[PDB]
DNA sequence: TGTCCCCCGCGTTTTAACCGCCAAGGGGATTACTCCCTAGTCTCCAGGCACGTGTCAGATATATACATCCTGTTCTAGAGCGGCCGCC
């Protein structure tokens, strides 16, 4: 369920940051989703927690 | 005994070693279900062991023959000496 289709990207990355701070996201998957979601442009949110 | 060049003691400046802190995510450790194969017999039989023996490669033997090592003699190169020549 890390895909972004059928949902606004901003609310989705907000929820992703919530579970990212929550410590149950397996970080590499989170930066991979950011890479294939915003075409590598969201590199500043890797250390949001 | 000498030497000289190879290694030690020390000054200086980097450098990565140890420590403080942080997550991670493969991975060690534990628990459980289950499934194969190894524990344990019965019977037997075909390979393995004790016995017996003809035999074929190794050892003894000795003149012959290697075979290299030690030594003697000769060849040739090197240093010393002496005679001859030119110069002051």
């Amino acid at each position: 369920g890390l895909d972004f289709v059928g949902e606004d990207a901003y609310k989705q990355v907000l929820r992703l940051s919530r579970r990212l701070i929550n410590g149950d996201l397996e970080h590499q998957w989170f930066e991979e989703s950011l890479r294939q979601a915003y075409n590598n442009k969201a590199f500043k949110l890797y250390t949001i927690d």
Side-chain angles (χ1 to χ4, degrees), chain A residues 13-35:
Chain A
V13 58
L14 271 202
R15 161 170 43 248
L16 278 197
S17 271
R18 278 177 235 151
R19 332 209 325 251
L20 186 270
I21 298 174
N22 281 318
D24 51 344
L25 213 49
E26 201 159 3
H27 279 192
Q28 54 175 70
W29 293 109
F30 164 78
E31 301 108 342
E32 186 70 30
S33 74
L34 286 209
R35 284 174 193 112

